[PDB]
Design a protein around this ligand. Sequence first.
Ligand SMILES: [Ca+2]
Ligand SMILES: [Ca+2]
Ligand SMILES: [Ca+2]
Ligand SMILES: [Ca+2]
Ligand SMILES: [Zn+2]
Length: 316
Amino acid sequence: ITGTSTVGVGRGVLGDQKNINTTYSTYYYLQDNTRGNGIFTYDAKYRTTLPGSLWADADNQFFASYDAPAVDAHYYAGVTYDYYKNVHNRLSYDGNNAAIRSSVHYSQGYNNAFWNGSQMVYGDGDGQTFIPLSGGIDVVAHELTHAVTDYTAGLIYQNESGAINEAISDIFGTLVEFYANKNPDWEIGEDVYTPGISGDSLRSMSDPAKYGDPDHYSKRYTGTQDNGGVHINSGIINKAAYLISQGGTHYGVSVVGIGRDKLGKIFYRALTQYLTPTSNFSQLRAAAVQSATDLYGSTSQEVASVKQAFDAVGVK
Ligand SMILES: [Ca+2]
Ligand SMILES: [Ca+2]
Ligand SMILES: [Ca+2]
Ligand SMILES: [Ca+2]
Ligand SMILES: [Zn+2]
C-alpha cells in the first residue's frame, strides 16, 4: 500500500519485545519499506485461502497474543533479508529485490510452515507439537531459503535433490540464527517445537541420529514417504555441513573445522553456481569442492575439509 514508513513495537511468540517496520495509511500495516521492494505480512485468519489480508493495526502497537506470530514472521523475514544482502550480496530471494510475503494464522492447529511457490506460510501449531512456527528464526530463514533455492539451483523436491534442498534450508536457517546471535545452535526449530519438552528440537545438524535421521549415506532412507525422505536424508548433508564448520571425528574420519562463515560462502556458491534441479549427493560434494577451490584454492585447508566431511558421511 502507498503510505509513509513508520516504526511499530510489539511482542513476538516467545514474549520478547521488538521494533517492526510498518506503513501508515489510515491503518498501520505490516509493510516494511526499508528492505528491497518491501516485506509484507498477512493474516490468514485460521483459513487456508492465501495470502489473506495485509496485516492492519489501529495503533502501531502489536502486543496482543493474536499479533505475536505476525510480529515474528515480519521481523525475522527482515533479519533473513539482511543476512542474504550483507553476507552474500543477494537482494531478496530472486536477487532483484522481489517483495517478500508471509501469511500467519494459516489453518487451525497447523503443525508446519512452507513456501507455496510464491510466499511463506506459517501455522500456529496445535500447542503440543508446535507453538506458532514463525517464532523460530531458523524456521523463518528455512522457509525463505526455499525461495532462494527455487530461484537458483531449483532442486527438485524429492529423493536426493530434495534432501539437498532441505539441508540447504536447514544450513542457511542455522546461519541466519547465528547471524542474529540470540541463543544460536545447530538444532532446527527448538524455539517453537514441543513447548512441554525442554531441550529437544525437530532436527539436529550436529547429531541428526538423535531424532532418528541418518548421519551417513549407508543409513539413507530409500522409501517413498516424505517425498523420498527429504526431511530425513537431509541429516546426511546437515551433518557434513556441521563437520565442515565445526570439525569432529565421525565414524573414524576426522574433519578440520573451518568455521561458519566459510561454510556459508562455500554452500552459497555451490547453490548459486553449480547445483542443478537434479543434483544428487555425489554431485553436491563435487559442487562444494569446486566452490571451495574457487574461493580458497585447490591446496587449501578449506578444500581438504570439504572432502573430509563428505568422506565422513559416506558421500563420494
Ligand atoms: Ca495494536
Ligand atoms: Ca536457538
Ligand atoms: Ca536453531
Ligand atoms: Ca521443546
Ligand atoms: Zn523445508
